[PDB]
Amino acid sequence: SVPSQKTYQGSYGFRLGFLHSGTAKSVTCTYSPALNKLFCQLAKTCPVQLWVDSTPPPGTRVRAMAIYKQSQHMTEVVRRCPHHERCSDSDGLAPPQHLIRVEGNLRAEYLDDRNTFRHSVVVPSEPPEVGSDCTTIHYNYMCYSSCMGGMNRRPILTIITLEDSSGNLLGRDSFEVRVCACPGRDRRTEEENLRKK
Ligand SMILES: CNCc1ccc2c(c1)c1ccc(Br)cc1n2CC(F)(F)F
Ligand SMILES: [Zn+2]
Numbered sequence: 557s558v559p560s561q562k563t564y565q566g567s568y569g570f571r572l573g574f575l576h577s578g579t580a581k582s583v584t585c586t587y588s589p590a591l592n593k594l595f596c597q598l599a600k601t602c603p604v605q606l607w608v609d610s611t612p613p614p615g616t617r618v619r620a621m622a623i624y625k626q627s628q629h630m631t632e633v634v635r636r637c638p639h640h641e642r643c644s645d646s647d648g649l650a651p652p653q654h655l656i657r658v659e660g661n662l663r664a665e666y667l668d669d670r671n672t673f674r675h676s677v678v679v680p681s682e683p684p685e686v687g688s689d690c691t692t693i694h695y696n697y698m699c700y701s702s703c704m705g706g707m708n709r710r711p712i713l714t715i716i717t718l719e720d721s722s723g724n725l726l727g728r729d730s731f732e733v734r735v736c737a738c739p740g741r742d743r744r745t746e747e748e749n750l751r752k753k
Contacts, residue, residue, distance in 0.1 A: 558630045559623055559674070561715055561730045569609030570718045570727025573690055579740040586739050590747055593732040594714070595739030598700055599645075601659060604716070605690040608727075612681060615721035620656050620695060621676040625711040625732060633674050636699045637706025645698070650677070655707075656714065659694040681718065697735045707735075 565571055574587035574594070585596040585603070596602050606618060622634040634655055635641070641653045650657040651666055654675045658664040667676045684691050695714075699706045711732055718727035736742050 557672070559621060559715055560728065561623070561713060562728060563730065564725070564728040566718065566725070566727035567610075568612045568718070568727060569607075570612075570729065571607050572716060572729045572731065573605035573607050574731075575603055575605075579744045581738060581740050583740040586743050587731070588743050588747055590750055591732065591743075592730075593734065593743075593746070595734050595736060595743045596697055597737065597739060598735055599696050599698055602695040602697065603692050604695055605692050606681070606716075606718075607690045608718075611683065612718065612726060613720070616681040616726065617678050617719045617721070617723075618681050618693065619676050619678040619717045619719055620658070620693075621674060621715050621717075622655050622712045622733070623674075623715065625713050629710050633672075634712055635675065635706065637703035637708075640699045640703060640706065650698075651675075655698055655712075657696045657698060659696055661693075678719070697733060699735065700737075701733075701735045 577583050577586040584600040587594050624630050635653050636655055646652050654666055656677050658677050658679055661679050664677055664679050682691055701707050702709050713730050713732050715730045720726055
């Protein structure tokens with residue numbers, strides 16, 4: 557009923573990385589290591605780095621899925637709100653109900669799980685470009701955390717899984733997400749609250 561969120565590096569040493577984008581009022585995506593939390597504007601590019609210590613086999617894939625963070629909501633499928641699922645903003649590949657999209661990857665596949673009804677987006681895993689030490693996937697979040705009838709102010713986590721060609725688990729990592737109008741201010745506010753507590 558609930559996908560695992562346990563961090564698991566696995567045989568290949570899989571883990572995520574994030575850029576250091578700062579907290580200026582104009583920032584569109586920013587990651588807080590102290591909160592393990594990404595703050596981003598609606599439908600803006602969120603770069604997520606994929607790091608491994610050793611090379612996984614051909615056919616390895618990378619899946620992203622959102623779940624509610626609070627235990628009393630974990631069994632509810634995270635989906636776009638009644639407004640955004642109808643707003644005709646599809647990219648030609650993502651179903652309009654899906655919160656998480658991958659940008660700029662024609663091999664992205666979108667799954668509606670036939671048993672759990674949860675949504676996810678999966679891409680073939682690829683090595684870095686020549687000159688780079690990690691692979692970057694660009695995600696978009698297609699509703700605000702506040703959207704009524706959707707996330708409705710409830711915090712979510714994104715779970716990133718490294719999978720073999722059958723979908724078996726090779727590695728797992730995760731981070732909280734807030735989709736909001738002013739990620740820089742909200743990151744500063746939440747980090748201050750953490751320090752005060
Ligand atoms: C030192 N490691 C460089 C590196 C980084 C990331 C790498 C790879 C190598 C690599 C090699 C083959 C395949 Br298939 C995917 C690969 N990825 C992406 C991910 F998601 F698996 F991490
Ligand atoms: Zn919405």
